[PDB]
Amino acid sequence: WFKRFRVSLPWLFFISICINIGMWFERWVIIVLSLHRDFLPSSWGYYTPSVW
């Protein structure tokens, strides 16, 4: 919102890091956080991602 944190590239580069990581967690909230606990509580997983 503030031009102080937009023209200043170290902040725009830190906010962009915080969005690329943040918008990855949105795709994790939408997919895994909504799949691992759904209908039928007897089908609740966790998905710790493997090394691959």
Nearest residue (CB) to other proteins, 6 versus 38: 38
CB 48, min distance to other proteins, A? 8
Contact (CB, 8 A) for 6 and 12: yes
User: Please, what is the minimum distance in Å from the beta carbon of residue 31 to other proteins?
Assistant: 9
Whichever of 14 and 44 has its CB closer to other proteins, that residue is 44
Helix, strand, coil % over all residues of the chain, rounded to 5: 65, 0, 35
- When the beta carbons of 2 and 39 are compared against other proteins, the nearer one is 39
Q: 16 and 31 in contact (C-beta within 8 Å)?
A: no
